[PDB]
């Protein structure tokens, strides 16, 4: 009875597509024509961070816009100060194949993981002063792509084995597990309400999961290639995801459909990282063309170009207050643009 | 600047000195990548180098030079994502089971995909034709040959430039096919290194060292030419 289930799933998918298309009253471009354009937003590098021994892969800002955490592919977690340009801490990692880093909102723990399939969380407020391995948890059969903190007790981790779970720092066990996507998860993005979170995999689809209920609520399959970037809107109602086809798509959770498609003919490199500002008008996207591009959330026009890198822009992150943006590339340079 | 904001400068300088020392230690040692299908006998190659973790690291010493080989420990068939993390390495060794002809096409396709990588276009790929004795026995038994799997073998001759001539012609045809697949869109910035080996030979370390030396020499020449 496999054919019956297949045709039933196909009919359900067609019905969902028809119901989504019936709600498409108008496009976002036709509504945002009367608003004034953002204009050429020029940005300059105020601080230049140097000291990385390998390619910069991941970075993360804390609750304050002063401290920053960064990971390097040689097994080093660096704590940068955006104001004094001095290094605060240096955590040596046991496995140099790190692909992501996380910063707890309390400012006491920092997570890391990658190809070692082991998530290591280290405490920064150790009474002994030196960095000690706080929680080295394992259990996943795939490479870790992204890790985030919801509070001082739980941590969400993504793995390449198409299975995610919420780990508890107190016991080091999977509290809530999910069914998983149909492809390897690439990155994560937590909503401000700490209740839902959208996860993107290589199957050109993004699924909205719940923290308490281990199930998916919404699914978006509008992309055409592997989704390599994902970031939620500051209001928690929409999220933009970039693919390898040099296309970014903005999916709204309340609308459950695509709103805006950022793309360009002369742009052929895929999107690596996406981050939103405090207001959400400016969307910064890093491409493999050694440049970063700023787009308007409503006008879908280019607002500025960033050519202060000599390699692929690996990651970019905007502070909580929108004062500056930290961009790290494979050239071991972590530049802080205004 | 306060007193405290000076102490921070001294701590930053100490951290920078520690990072410089760690960079020196990391640069004194060389790093290599190991790739291969499940049918290939890479485990024997790792075991003979006596001179839930998805990554296996093997450290050894050849000619007073430290080599750290990194191999996939436990992962799925996905290869398009984690291949970008193993770039900028000294060399990549691709193990292929030249005995079985079924997996030979898959190995050739994997080698063509890895060589034509957009990010790994500056890293050379070393090829080790493992299991030569098994291939020789299979081609001398007369049960299965390359004719049933590749038609071009019917129009290939031994080049002019104690082993049976059939095995020699077969391995030369395999090497020629590998060279023709590798040189396709190579741009001359990186070249391949094929070598015949088995699971009992001990001179593999010398060949790996010579290949790494040639790669470093080519890198120095490219640096001097400002390409």
């Amino acid at each position, epitope marked *: 009875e496999l054919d019956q289930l297949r045709q039933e799933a196909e009919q359900l998918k067609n019905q969902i597509r028809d119901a989504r298309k019936a709600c498409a009253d108008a496009t976002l471009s036709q509504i945002t024509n009367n608003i004034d354009p953002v204009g050429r937003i020029q940005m300059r590098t105020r601080r230049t961070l140097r000291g990385h021994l390998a390619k910069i892969y991941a970075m993360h800002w804390g609750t304050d816009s*002063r401290l920053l955490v960064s990971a390097s592919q040689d097994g080093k977690l660096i704590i940068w100060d955006s104001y004094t340009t001095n290094k*605060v*801490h240096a955590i040596p990692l046991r496995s140099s194949w790190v692909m992501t880093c996380a910063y707890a909102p309390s400012g006491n723990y920092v997570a890391c993981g990658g190809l070692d399939n082991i998530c290591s969380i280290y405490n920064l407020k150790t009474r002994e*002063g030196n960095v000690r391995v706080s929680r080295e948890l394992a259990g996943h059969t795939g490479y870790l792509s992204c890790c985030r903190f919801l509070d001082d007790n739980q941590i969400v981790t993504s793995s390449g084995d198409t299975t995610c779970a919420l780990w508890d720092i107190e016991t080091g066990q999977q509290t809530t597990t999910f069914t998983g996507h149909t492809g390897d998860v690439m990155s994560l993005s937590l909503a401000p309400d700490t209740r839902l979170f959208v996860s993107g995999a290589c199957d050109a689809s993004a699924k909205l999961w719940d923290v308490r209920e281990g199930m998916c609520r919404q699914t978006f399959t509008g992309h055409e290639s592997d989704i390599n970037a994902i970031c939620f809107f500051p209001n928690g109602n929409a999220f933009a995801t970039g693919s390898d086809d040099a296309t970014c798509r903005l999916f709204d959770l309340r609308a459950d459909q695509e709103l805006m498609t950022y793309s360009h003919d002369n742009i052929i490199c895929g999107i690596t990282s996406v981050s939103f500002s405090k207001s959400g008008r400016l969307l910064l996207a890093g491409y493999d063309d050694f440049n970063c591009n700023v787009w308007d959330a409503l006008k879908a026009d280019r607002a500025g170009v960033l050519a202060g890198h000599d390699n692929r822009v690996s990651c970019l992150g905007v502070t909580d207050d929108g004062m500056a943006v930290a961009t790290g590339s494979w050239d071991s340079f972590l530049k802080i643009w205004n | 600047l*306060s007193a*405290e904001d000076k102490a921070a400068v001294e701590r930053s300088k100490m951290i920078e000195k520690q990072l410089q020392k760690d960079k020196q230690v990391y640069r004194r040692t060389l790093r290599l990548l190991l790739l291969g299908a499940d049918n290939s006998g890479k485990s024997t190659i790792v075991k003979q180098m006596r001179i839930t973790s998805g990554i296996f690291e093997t450290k050894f010493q050849v000619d007073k030079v430290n080599f750290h080989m990194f191999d996939v420990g436990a992962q799925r068939d996905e290869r398009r994502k984690w291949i970008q993390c193993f770039n900028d390495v000294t060399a990549i060794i691709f193990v292929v089971d030249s005995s079985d002809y079924n997996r030979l096409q898959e190995a050739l396709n994997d080698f063509k995909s890895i060589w034509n990588n957009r990010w790994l276009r500056t890293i050379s790929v070393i090829l080790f034709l493992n299991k030569q004795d098994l291939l020789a026995e299979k081609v001398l038994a007369g049960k299965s040959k390359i004719e049933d799997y590749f038609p071009e073998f019917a129009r290939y001759t031994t080049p002019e430039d104690g082993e049976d001539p059939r095995v020699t012609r077969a391995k030369y045809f395999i090497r020629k096919e590998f060279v023709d697949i590798s040189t396709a869109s190579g741009d001359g910035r990186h070249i391949c290194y094929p070598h015949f080996t088995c699971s009992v030979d001990t001179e593999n370390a010398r060949r790996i060292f010579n290949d790494c030396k040639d790669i470093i020499l080519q890198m120095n020449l490219r640096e001097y030419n400002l390409v």
Partner: single-chain antibody, 230 residues
Framework: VQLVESGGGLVQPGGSRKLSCSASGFAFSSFGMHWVRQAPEKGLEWVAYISSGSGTIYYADTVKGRFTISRDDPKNTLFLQMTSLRSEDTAMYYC??????????????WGQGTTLTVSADIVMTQATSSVPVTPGESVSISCRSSKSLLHSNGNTYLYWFLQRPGQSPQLLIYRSNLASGVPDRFSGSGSGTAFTLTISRLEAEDVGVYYCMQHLEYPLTFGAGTKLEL
């Protein structure tokens, strides 16, 4: 962590003495070391300070040329050589650790210290020295400074130390910013010139002497200290 000091005792005037300090339970090479002297029936006073790797060493203007501080990082030890001791040098010395970064807590742990018996900058001045207080009421100690400690970066360099009879001084506030290991009853407020340390609930373990310290420059100067009897 533990800080065991040794070398004190009776010393004839004009001699020398090498005070030793063994540290355990933490990274000795990561924390900067400070020497704090205390005279009998008097307040505290800074002596010398050394940083990691002996890259920055400072001494008090009164003891320049006489004392010499050194550290053994492979052995995790501190040494202080004193030559030409005077009749006033009879005091109890304490070794304190301090790390400096954003969100740190310098002068968090005070050692046991050892006794030694022989034979223009910023100065903290307190208006009161002893305030009788009964259980049930609140405590509000005021302090006035001669120079505004409000630096351009916006950080207030004010440290509070509660020394109990027989025990080592415990850090309460390092910057308003409450320190670790202390209850939330203690609080600090005020402007860059005047400061106020308030206590929400006064318990039986909060008795002792409160000392204030500034950290705007290297030469430190402790206050008179307010003693509470109960």
């Amino acid at each position: 962590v533990q800080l065991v000091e040794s070398g004190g005792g009776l010393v004839q005037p004009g001699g020398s003495r090498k005070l030793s300090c063994s540290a355990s339970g933490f990274a000795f090479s990561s924390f900067g070391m400070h020497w704090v002297r205390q005279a009998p029936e008097k307040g505290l006073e800074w002596v010398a300070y050394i940083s990691s790797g002996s890259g920055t060493i400072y001494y008090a203007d009164t003891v320049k040329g006489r004392f010499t501080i050194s550290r053994d990082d492979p052995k995790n030890t501190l040494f202080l050589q004193m030559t030409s001791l005077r009749s006033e040098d009879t005091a109890m010395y304490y070794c304190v650790r301090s790390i400096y970064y954003y969100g740190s807590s310098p002068f968090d742990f005070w050692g046991q210290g050892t006794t030694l018996t022989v034979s223009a900058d910023i100065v903290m001045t307190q208006a009161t020295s002893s305030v009788p207080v009964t259980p049930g009421e609140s405590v509000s100690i005021s302090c006035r400074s001669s120079k505004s400690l409000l630096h351009s970066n916006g950080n207030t360099y004010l440290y509070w130390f509660l020394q109990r009879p027989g025990q080592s001084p415990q850090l309460l506030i390092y910057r308003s910013n409450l320190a670790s290991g202390v209850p939330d009853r203690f609080s600090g407020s005020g402007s860059g010139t005047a400061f106020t340390l308030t206590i929400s609930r006064l318990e039986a373990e909060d008795v002792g002497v409160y000392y204030c310290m500034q950290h705007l420059e290297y030469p430190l100067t402790f206050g008179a200290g307010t003693k509470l009897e109960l």
